[PDB]
């Protein structure tokens, strides 16, 4: 059940136990003794069962427009994500795009994807060119008690009298 590995003893061929996440092989197994698993030193990690003779180094630095998603822990590497108004793609970390007047936000900006704009279906509008405004519905002069003097699909809602 316990993950295992083969080793060339300085004596024979024996079958040593592997070491759990957060540890490494500090000393190989011997016929007398089970594997000595030591804890990963600071700024080092092992995320899986392993027979490394040295832990892995937390080698990711967050840079530019990035912050820590995960901290360096004995069982995982450091990780970085793009900041609030920023998203990453193709190897770069660039600021979210704004939906212009006519299209609305159907998907808010995530550290992964860009703000997806979609033109508002007949009956809705988008006033501003920010990345917050969704497709808001038009005013009903009908069910309000007025008359539709002017209506604009693209923006500006509608004007009643």
């Amino acid at each position: 059940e316990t993950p295992t590995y083969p080793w060339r003893d300085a004596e024979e061929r024996l079958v040593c136990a592997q070491c759990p996440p957060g540890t490494f092989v500090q000393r190989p197994c011997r016929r007398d003794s089970p594997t000595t698993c030591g804890p990963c030193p600071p700024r080092h990690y092992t995320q899986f069962w392993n027979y490394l003779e040295r832990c892995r180094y937390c080698n990711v630095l967050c840079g530019e427009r990035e912050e820590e998603a995960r901290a360096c822990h004995a069982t995982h590497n450091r990780a970085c994500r793009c900041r609030t108004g920023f998203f990453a793609h193709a190897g770069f970390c660039l600021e979210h795009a704004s939906c212009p007047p006519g299209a609305g936000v159907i998907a808010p900006g995530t550290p992964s994807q860009n703000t997806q704009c979609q033109p508002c279906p007949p009956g809705t509008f988008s006033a501003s060119s920010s990345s917050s405004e969704q497709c808001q519905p038009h005013r009903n002069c009908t069910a309000l008690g007025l008359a539709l003097n002017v209506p604009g699909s693209s923006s500006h809602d509608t004007l009643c009298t």
Binding site: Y5, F48, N50, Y51, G91, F92
Partner: protein, 143 residues
């Protein structure tokens, strides 16, 4: 005395069936033309296999040709002692000119162990110029 060495050259790559989003590894020629392996250095299916522990110089050039936002070459070390590979070298360049070509060259020294495997991964395998052995290649030698 007799030190492990190999110089590998590009062949026609087979299209990758599925995308893990992972950078696909290149396949190489290992004995014809300028390609060779000697002194216990084995090449098997994308991997250079390290036969002896020591310090190695490793290099690769990949010529990219386009007829994306970036092209990337990585040289990767796989070991049995751990499920995740190690990125030894990365050459990454942003692409801005509808017909273009560009080489990426990487070389450096690393402490390696007997049993370690080396591969070359690229961002987009269809952009790789495979037409001649002198443009895309991969090698390593014990110091």
């Amino acid at each position: 005395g007799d030190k492990p060495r190999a110089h590998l050259t590009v062949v026609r790559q087979t299209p990758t069936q599925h995308f893990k989003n992972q950078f696909p590894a290149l396949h190489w020629e290992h004995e014809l033309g300028l390609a060779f392996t000697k002194n216990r250095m084995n090449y098997t299916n994308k991997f250079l296999l390290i036969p002896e522990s020591g310090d190695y110089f490793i290099y690769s050039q990949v010529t990219f040709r386009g007829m994306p936002d970036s092209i990337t070459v990585v040289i990767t070390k796989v070991t049995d002692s751990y499920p995740e590979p190690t990125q030894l070298l990365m050459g990454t360049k942003s692409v801005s000119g509808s017909n273009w070509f560009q080489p990426i060259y990487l070389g450096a020294m690393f402490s390696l162990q007997e049993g370690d495997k080396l591969m070359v991964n690229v961002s987009d395998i269809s952009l790789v110029d495979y037409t001649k052995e002198d443009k895309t290649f991969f090698g390593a030698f014990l110091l």
